[PDB]
Amino acid sequence: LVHVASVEKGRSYEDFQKVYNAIALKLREDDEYDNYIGYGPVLVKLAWHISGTWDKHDNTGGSYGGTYRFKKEFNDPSNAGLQNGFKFLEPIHKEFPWISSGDLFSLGGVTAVQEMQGPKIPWRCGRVDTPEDTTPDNGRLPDADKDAGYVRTFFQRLNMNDREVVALMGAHALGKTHLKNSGYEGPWGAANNVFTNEFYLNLLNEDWKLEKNDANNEQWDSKSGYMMLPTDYSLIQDPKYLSIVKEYANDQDKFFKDFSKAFEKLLENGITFPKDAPSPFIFKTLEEQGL
Ligand code: HEM
After folding, report:
1. Which EC class is this protein assigned?
2. Domains, the chain, ordered by start
């Protein structure tokens, strides 16, 4: 397929900045969600889940079509728990009806990261809603009970190399697993609504014990009360992965730079940007605007 980005007719930077600010102000206000974690982490997960269905082989899936809006994709067992991010964004969509779905979902992830003090992520508009029949079948998102080999193979379908895989996985500093959604339970660290290199530190520094949880799935548990999925843990089992983990644990700046690039790439996979398309936008945070 060819998916050409088409800017929402007659909208510019200032228009998008207003959507960003609406999301951001609502994040600030609805702070009680999930025991005061806030909706930040769920928005990031939502942006990854709608993008992660991409298949570099036939160009199907990815963020372009905003297909998560369709029941098939929406009810993906792998998407359990995301309906919360969905409901959070509805009201915003209602306020800015001209924005495409794909653009709203992706921008939500960007906003969340920047407002949680992460790096600035350049973002491009132009995703266009596609018909319910362009909706990818379930089973394109990754399992958590696998090893490094699985992770490498998987990510290859999205065109991500080792460095990009490790950078992206640092998003696991945010939020937590919920038994009911995924069959895993617990957070990855302590500051789960602030974007930092905490994930890599925990990984290297905690004394992890393999145990079975109440869903009868294995997870690595630390005495600090943190957890790691098998796939997270696999980052220290693979020699190639481990050296990048170390770098990130050592330099947050490097991590932020790599994450930013990787995240934008993920969000733009499968989209063709004409040469006349506006360059990527860099949105200001609420704090930068004095709001
Ligand atoms: C092997 C690849 C991955 C696997 C197996 C995986 C698996 C999971 C699972 C099982 C959960 C918990 C869901 C729940 O119970 O609510 C989760 C949460 C989360 N994932 Fe990942 N994930 C992967 C990659 C990523 C990537 C690439 C990102 C973003 C860059 C990401 C961002 C998040 C965030 C922010 C949360 C917390 C959500 C919340 O608190 O609701 N994950 N992931």
Report:
1. oxidoreductase
2. 1-141+263-291 (1.10.520.10), 142-262 (1.10.420.10)
Indicate the SS3 state at residue 244. helix
Cα 181 from chain centre: 16
Q: Indicate the angle between helix axes 252-268 and 239-250, nearest 10 degrees.
A: 120
Task: Name the structure determination technique.
Answer: X-ray
Determine the atom of ligand 1 nearest the C-alpha atom of 47. Answer: 29
Report which of 234, 186, 232, 190 is spatially closest to residue 213, judged by C-alpha positions.
186
Name all residues whose Cβ lies below 6 A of ligand 1: 41-42, 44-45, 48, 81, 142, 144, 151, 168, 171-172, 174-178, 181-182, 184, 229, 231
Resolution in A: 2.2
54 is catalytic: no
CB proximity list for 133: less than 8 A, separation 6 or greater: none
